[PDB]
From Swiss-Prot, chain A:
Pathway assigned in UniProt: Carbohydrate biosynthesis; 3-deoxy-D-manno-octulosonate biosynthesis; 3-deoxy-D-manno-octulosonate from D-ribulose 5-phosphate: step 2/3; Bacterial outer membrane biogenesis; lipopolysaccharide biosynthesis
Name of encoding gene: kdsA
Principal location: cytoplasm
Entry's EC annotation: 2.5.1.55
Domain of life: Bacteria
Membrane-traversing stretches: none
Enzyme class: transferase
Protein name from the UniProt record: 2-dehydro-3-deoxyphosphooctonate aldolase
Location relative to the cell: Cytoplasm
UniProtKB/Swiss-Prot annotation, chain C:
Keyword field: Cytoplasm, Lipopolysaccharide biosynthesis, Transferase
Gene: kdsA
EC number of this enzyme: 2.5.1.55
Protein name: 2-dehydro-3-deoxyphosphooctonate aldolase
UniProt key word Endoplasmic reticulum: no
Annotated organism of origin: Neisseria meningitidis serogroup B (strain ATCC BAA-335 / MC58)
Keyword Isomerase: no
Entry GO MF terms: 3-deoxy-8-phosphooctulonate synthase activity
Length: 251, 251, 249, 249
């Protein structure tokens, strides 16, 4: 199943879409700078692009910086949308945040550690917006339908599934390349995407991204952490593999 | 390090404390009848006991009953304390719930999926009450220290760690019996309790084996979410008496 | 099901048996010294004891001591049996090793990784001796029935199942305490023992907590390679004694 | 590092090589038919191809057919080599087997469970033959160098590393796509190949094969859906040709 996001078609059998950007919003100026580089690079490559950022990092240390918060963050997003004419994605943590975020941000994201906060799921669903579901590391590819079931029960079917690795012993993540196919089969062929950045915690990034896309995915999710100047060389290679894979009929 | 909860001494060198009750609070009459059974068996064997329930928890399904809520829950708790003169324990999900819940409930529980949530940790710490931290399944015993550090900076030292199991491949949980010892060394020998029920996802034969294994490592308490109970508690008590009556190994 | 090993009764509801000795044999002299130590300790605690050692060490680096080897090793075992009148256990890696080893050793052991190899299974089974089957670290407890089933097909049912941990990510082992029960329920309550030594990889304390957690499930025996051994055993016995006096539910 | 297996060039930066054939050698005519189809498809696509089978692999049951054996096995290989002019690969389990096998076979294989038995590594090393080393499922990728060092000490540097998955909970395997990179960096960029058949435990095989070869590999290892092979190799070749044509970043 495909999902229109303004002009972009996101589907497992459509050219891959890049979800990319910073980790958290810090300034209007820093955000515009990084997004211009993301846009300028993606536009020349002809890769549909969606800008990602967090307005709050609620898992941060007690005395560390957490973000600009919701109010100013949304304004930053309005300006990004205005200047580049692209869709944006951000994560939501509290039910009450869902509607005000949804009016600005085309894609709202459910954090992996929160997949089972029922109230948040319902408030995200009410919005009618496109949802990105981060698969928790402790969840098997086929249990992913349980969360998909919940959004359908809440009346929203415009969902993307996001792989970010599976828990492997202590303090380590493996990505089961077969998971992508299982999520596709059990969840009605909703768009699946690969968060390669988070899957890497604990050259490598490229191998992983490439392997993931070989299985035939809707999109690639990343933070930049990756350098730029390498973002272009990096994506050139992804585009080349994605083109090839997508040009071959399924089966 | 010992924690006085009213007249109960909870600590890894103290007779084990049973934590048990119901999943979600329905009514006063339903709560009293179930608590009564627990209180009868525990008193019959002289086992210190703490009643457990949720006033408001997210569930398996969207429209599953979350519980009577804060206001009616606290009244139910107050009567249970009045009735049986025992400590109670409940979970909190929102910073705002912490202060009024802490007025009634001797121990407050941090849900596993919210463990890294700084705002909630602060709110729970600021209460000054005994806090139970539920260990996420995708977390290693060595990184529980980080959650423990967060509580100390926020000014609360009165903490219980609660083992619930670790991810073991897909759709499985294993309890690493070495984990218990690692939490003691690395976190100042805080009270550790073993949540046997959620560790298990006949099955009573199995709950026993697991419970006995845990308690052989020498632990502050036992955590259930389940006459059949008596014969069970007889065996835990036997083992806990034997273990707690021997000095820890000599340096 | 109980197994008579000479005068020792090994079974999931009998007093636990200690298995232990040295990693690998080097000389008659230091071997007799270690064995004497174990017999001294277990005797005064009243714990049955089977002495364990390898004669070969085949995964070692090429330039390293691999051990005394088979002809010499059995000679040391013969003299260990003569000196102390105890049973012994050792491991075999090649089908031809089996029979000569079985002449001397009461229990012969199938290394976990060789559990696959049917030839060795067959050769081990034809000796008639008591076999210790280590559980491969990637195998589920319930899959032990298949190997047990192989030994029954080869005509030997005097089998002890041995737990040594499971693979847990890279370079790590966890011991799943429910495994013991699953194994006891699926393999007809054959003796189950616990190799805590290899289940591991301050600390000597990790061994006790592990042994204690394991023995609390109710097991036939245990493996263990100023007085740390007796300090350990005193506690293990107290636990085993308590657990084995409870009726089975 | 490039390995010349006869006229074939095998390396992480060469066009991928296909290791393919049957599980166990059962008969002469049957073997030649399967190999005929593999050769037919591969020559048709210009993929270098090496034939694979065992003559003695232990099986799930103790009495299931292990294979034709060493004597007849080597004769069947002689016959495949004569008829098709292609190289062959087989596995070996005993030190004494290494020599008779290496005289006929172009690549000898060390089965994963045996991968740390030094006697066998040394006997393999001493042949001077090309060696395929299966990674054991319970070993981490950065521990391969230890096996690689053992081979070097014994005087053989012409080694292939073969991925077949890692233990992931009970009775389940996962392929860590980062394992290939780690092996390249730590073992001197030796040829790495991917055994998807044993990695599984289909559309899956294809997906796994493609993910695998996306990371840039010397070859692909598989057993036999025997006619969808052409359609399958069409896709693998496509991806491999694309990847291989770009320089390493």
């Amino acid at each position: 199943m495909d999902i229109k996001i303004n002009d972009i078609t996101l589907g497992n059998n459509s050219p891959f879409v890049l979800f990319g950007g910073i980790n958290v919003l810090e300034s209007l100026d820093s955000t515009l700078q990084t997004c211009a580089h993301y846009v300028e690079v993606t536009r020349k490559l002809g890769i549909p692009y969606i800008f990602k950022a967090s307005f709050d990092k609620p898992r941060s240390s007690i005395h560390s910086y957490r973000g600009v918060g919701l109010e100013e963050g949304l304004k930053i997003f309005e300006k990004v949308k205005a200047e580049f004419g692209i869709p944006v994605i951000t994560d939501v943590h509290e039910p009450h945040q869902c509607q005000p975020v949804a009016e600005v941000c085309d894609v709202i994201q459910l954090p992996a550690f929160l997949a089972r906060q029922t109230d948040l799921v319902v408030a995200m669903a009410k919005t009618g917006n496109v949802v990105n579901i981060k698969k928790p590391q402790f969840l098997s590819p086929s249990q992913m339908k349980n969360i998909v079931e919940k959004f359908h029960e809440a009346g929203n079917g415009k969902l993307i599934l996001c792989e970010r690795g599976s828990s492997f012993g202590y303090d380590n993540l493996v990505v089961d390349m077969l998971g992508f196919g299982v999520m596709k089969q059990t969840c009605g062929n909703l768009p699946v995407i690969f968060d390669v950045t988070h899957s890497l915690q604990t050259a490598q990034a490229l191998d992983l991204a490439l392997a993931g896309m070989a299985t035939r995915l809707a999109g690639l999710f990343l933070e930049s952490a990756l350098p730029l100047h390498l973002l272009e060389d990096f994506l050139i290679r992804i585009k080349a593999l994605d083109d090839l894979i997508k040009s071959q009929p399924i089966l």
